[PDB]
Specification:
Shape: elongated
CATH topology of the largest domain: Rhopdopsin 7-helix transmembrane proteins
Distance between the termini: 103 Å
GO molecular function, one term: protein-containing complex binding
GO biological process, one term: response to lipid
Family: Belongs to the G-protein coupled receptor 1 family. Neurotensin receptor subfamily. NTSR1 sub-subfamily.
Helix content: over 70%
Strand order of the largest sheet: 1-2
Number of domains: 2
Number of strands: 2
CATH architecture of the largest domain: Up-down Bundle
Strand content: under 5%
Order of helices and strands: HHHHHHEEHHHHHHHHHHHH
CATH class of the largest domain: Mainly Alpha
Keywords: Cell membrane, Disulfide bond, G-protein coupled receptor, Glycoprotein, Lipoprotein, Membrane, Palmitate, Receptor, Transducer, Transmembrane, Transmembrane helix
Subcellular location: Cell membrane; Membrane raft
Radius of gyration: 32 Å
Number of helices: 18
């Protein structure tokens, strides 16, 4: 019982996967080969790109010819027969072990942030990749001995040389070592990481309006590596099952139906193995899209603090996050208003910066503008619609801080917009009380007159 359509249909998909997957992975290697501490990401995607390319470049064509179509006459000889299964198992390992390495490094980043900043290094990562490939090569050696050509008819076929019990051990080993062991670790680590991360995400409540970039980056990383785990399982599960079923269901019991089932199941199972390889460049696009967006934001905070207006406009233009925040909860607007760079401050608000943004301490951009003393920046923030009576953890409004450093000019501009002259903090001191304590006699004189006006309004 034979049908050609299955082979033709499979061949079409095999070609579709080959052409795109080979080119995609080829470019992925070429791109990274040309072009921070997040170059460790590049090394891992380079390994997958290579391991996935070899599958499509060497395993697929040999599969498509001598396994799908032409059966009896084997055209790759004893070396090609031995080598095929070696290069296959080397890449089944290398890929499986790279997917774990990813989840181990994401876990380390979330679980041990302080440790990961010291422990993780480029030179260290390089060693890890070296080990993975060398481990995979060493673990694939058995396939050079277990597989070899035999003459059935010249009708020479690439069939195992060793016995079923011997063959059952190496395959049982391969499956656990290069799938189950990895997938358990990868899954649980990613599950623990997601749980661990969700604590940090939820912990950032009230204290900071905008959650840090790292949290948003790691939260993005979890989603991706979740897809990587689910992707790898679905692609590789059927293939491993087929291999295991082969040896365990090899009792000569199998009728003209188990053979038929295996014929199709082989095509389906292998097709998904190449799909795994063919998908890889998507994971590269997702990872780079994430790290790029993180580096933009990271740069924006530096640039906005630096006072380089040109760089800020450039970053924002590309698609950097204006409402990003550092570990403290400091948005770019905080840094600009603090350092005093009106030029930048005007841009950030134009693009859509949260003018009412509370950091860890609860200090809005207007607090930082008053504390220092930028009469220009204060006037701007209010035009956009900064809260005039916003209070921090202690309870000090901007008018407290303007008074606390005697900005007579600034004190006047708040009053115009409608600053609460009668506002007491944790220590009970009003803006006037601080003005008196400071010795800003002019400032104190104003606050007094403003409060008095409110009295007459009552009567």
């Amino acid at each position: 019982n034979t049908d050609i359509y299955s082979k033709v249909l499979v061949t079409a998909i095999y070609l579709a996967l080959f052409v795109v997957g080979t080119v995609g992975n080829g470019v992925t290697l070429f791109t990274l080969a040309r072009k921070s501490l997040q170059s460790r990401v590049d090394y891992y995607l380079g390994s997958l790109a290579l391991s996935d390319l070899l599958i499509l470049l060497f395993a697929l064509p040999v599969d498509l010819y001598n396994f799908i179509w032409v059966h009896h006459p084997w055209a790759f000889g004893d070396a090609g027969c031995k080598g095929y299964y070696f290069l296959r198992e080397a890449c089944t390992y290398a890929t499986a072990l790279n997917v774990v390495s990813l989840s181990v490094e994401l876990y380390l980043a979330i679980c041990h942030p302080f440790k990961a900043k010291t422990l993780m290094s480029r030179s260290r990562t390089k060693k890890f990749i070296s080990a993975i490939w060398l481990a995979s090569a060493l673990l694939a050696i058995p396939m050079l001995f277990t597989m070899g050509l035999q003459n059935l008819s010249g009708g020479l076929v690439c069939t195992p040389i060793v016995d079923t019990a011997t063959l059952r051990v190496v395959i049982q080993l391969n499956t656990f070592m290069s799938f189950l062991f990895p997938m358990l670790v990868a899954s649980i680590l990613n599950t623990v990481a997601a749980r661990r991360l969700t604590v940090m995400v939820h912990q950032a409540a009230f204290n900071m309006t905008i959650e840090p970039g790292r949290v948003q980056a790691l939260r993005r990383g979890v989603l991706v590596l979740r897809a990587v785990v689910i992707a790898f399982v679905v692609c590789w599960l059927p293939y491993h099952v087929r291999r295991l079923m082969f040896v365990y269901i090899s009792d000569e019991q199998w009728t003209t139906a188990l053979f038929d089932f295996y014929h199709y199941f082989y095509m389906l199972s292998n097709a998904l193995v190449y799909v795994s390889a063919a998908i890889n460049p998507i994971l590269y696009n997702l990872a780079e899209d994430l790290v790029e967006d993180w580096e933009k934001a990271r740069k924006l905070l530096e640039a906005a603090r630096k006072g380089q207006d040109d760089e800020v406009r450039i970053l924002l233009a590309n698609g950097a996050d204006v409402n990003t925040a550092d570990e403290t909860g400091f948005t770019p607007l905080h840094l600009a208003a603090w350092e005093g760079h009106l030029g930048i401050v005007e841009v950030l608000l134009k693009n859509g910066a949260d003018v009412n943004a509370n950091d860890e301490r609860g200090h809005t951009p207007l607090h930082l503008a008053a504390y220092t003393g930028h009469l220009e920046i204060v006037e701007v923030l209010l035009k956009n619609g900064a809260g005039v009576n916003a209070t921090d953890v202690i309870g000090t409004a901007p008018l407290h801080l303007a008074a606390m450093w005697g900005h007579l000019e600034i004190v006047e501009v708040l009053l115009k917009n409608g600053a609460d002259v009668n506002a007491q903090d944790k220590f009970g001191k009003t803006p006037f009380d601080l003005a008196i304590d400071n010795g800003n006699e002019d400032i104190a004189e104003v606050l007094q007159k403003a409060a008095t006006r409110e009295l007459e309004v009552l009567f």
